[PDB]
Structure formats: C-alpha cells, structure tokens
Amino acid sequence: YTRVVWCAVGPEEQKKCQQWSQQSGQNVTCATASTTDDCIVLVLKGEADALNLDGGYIYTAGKCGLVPVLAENRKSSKHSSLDCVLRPTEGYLAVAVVKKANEGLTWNSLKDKKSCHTAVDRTAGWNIPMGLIVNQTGSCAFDEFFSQSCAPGADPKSRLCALCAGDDQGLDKCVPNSKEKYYGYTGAFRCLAEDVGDVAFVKNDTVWENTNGESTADWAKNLKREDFRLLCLDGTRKPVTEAQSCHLAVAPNHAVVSRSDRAAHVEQVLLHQQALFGKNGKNCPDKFCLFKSETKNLLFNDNTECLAKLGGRPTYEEYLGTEYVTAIANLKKCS
C-alpha cells in the first residue's frame, strides 16, 4: 500500500522519474506538472504524494498544510561520526555573484543593473536578495530596481523576464522548470557566465560545482573561479573562497514535503529507495542514481549525499525558522 507517487516538474524531471519508477519495480510512480506550484496542487488534491522543494516553496506548501518529511543532507565537517541519515543539516549560503572584470560593481551599486535569479519565490534566488533590497530602498517596487532580469515564474512580457531564454526551440521563455535555459541554480549561474546578466543570486556550492573543471558541460567546462567575485553586504567584494564571511544569508536545506496523512509511508519508502539508489546505494551507479542528473539538479540537488531524518517532528515554520518565515511574510506585503 506504499506505492508512492512522485511529482516531477517539467519534462526532464519526468524522464528521470520514469527511470526511477522502472528500477523501483513501481514502488514509486510519477505524476508530472509544469511548475512547482502546480505540483503542490496535485499533492493537495491527493493525485501525487510528494516532491523535494526549495525553502521558499516549503513556505507555500506549508501554508496549505503540507509538512516536511526528510531533508537533503550534503558533505559535512563537524559531527562527522554520525550516519548521513541521522546527521543535523546545516543550511546553505545564499550569495550574490558577479564577474571580477565588472570592476566597481558592489551591493551598493546594483540599481539599474541586469540580474539572474533561480526563480521567483526561491530562497537564494529571490526571497533573500529582494527582501533585502525592498528593505534597503524603502520601496515595494522590486520590479523596477534592476533594468532587466531573468526571474522564472514572473510575467513573460515584463522586464523581470527580459533576459530569460526559453528552451532550445525558443519556446517556454521564463517558465519555472528546467526547460528554461536560465532556470535554477545552474541556469542563473549560466546567465552570469555568458554575461547576459551582471549579477546572479545563487548559493555558494553552485559557483564551485560549475568551475575549474567540476562541470564538463559546454557553457561551464572552461570557467575559472578566479574570474568571479562575491558581493558582501558591507559594500566589499571577495573571492568565492570567502563565502563564510560574504553571504546574504544562511538558508534551510531543500526538503521533501507530503500530506500529513502520507508522511509516514513516504518516509519509509524513501529510506529504502536511497539504500538502493542513493550515494553508495547498492544499485548506484550500476542501475540508477537518484542524486545524479548531469549537474541539472533534477528531483534532488546533484550534491545530495542522503535524505536525513528530521529532529523534533517540525512544522514547516519550525523547519524554515521563525526569522526566515517573517522575512518572507514581510516581502509578500509588496505584492
């Protein structure tokens, strides 16, 4: 009775999910939607059981009564003795990244520049930087701050979508799924790399995983970390090796959500599925790897080591943290 229906966002996640379904012996099956918000609705209607969400989308799903189930956990440091599945998660660093050759651009001179965002409503790509900006400017007019941007999920004819590129046919401009060339951590960092935008709002890991030979994808195979700088909130610029003293925020790890009535069955199936297909799973790399997708972060981030159990059966508010929830709430007063 634990057949779990996963929700895939867009056609590339659907194909990966179908491969997972086949390998799992239909213990997992797939439903697909065009946007994360649409996948959330399938879950609320009981037509899907679950999916993995960024923290800004956990806020949306949690105000509708979905609950967190397990969290992505990446490479640690402290607490190294514990199993991954039992390790406390530590959040990721939200950063603002520019080209080093774009000299004299700082946090304080971002007005009228071009921006690259993972998607509207995501933590590092949107909630953190636009929340800071609205606050700093004393103005809700966040869609008139940058001259042009790519922020998937915005109005396709607005300046907030002017920089997005759509799929290789040129269709689906500014849609919030992987078919949009500049969607997600990797799409927004590509948007900066090709110099479509002046600044990209991503996380620290994205910079490292797509530079210095860590990616062999054509747009990234030849990028060097030294060609990039982080923008710090005190007006200074630093090397990407200094993210710990030059970030915008610490963000809560992406996590799986489901209906409260399905949480327990979803949790058990996932724990067993990752034993088979997770990082050292017994059929990965042989048959299927749940946490790989050629750096495209499909279903899970490709840097995921395991999905970890949560401490204290937290509410979505306790998971996200009171201060982040309040920042989101404040930013949403604007629109």
């Binding site: 959330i40 609320l44 105000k63 009564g65």
Partner: peptide
Amino acid sequence: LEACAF
C-alpha cells in the same frame, strides 16, 4: 498574514 494561496 496567513492563508493557502490556492
């Protein structure tokens, strides 16, 4: 300050 957007 609270309501499901759907």
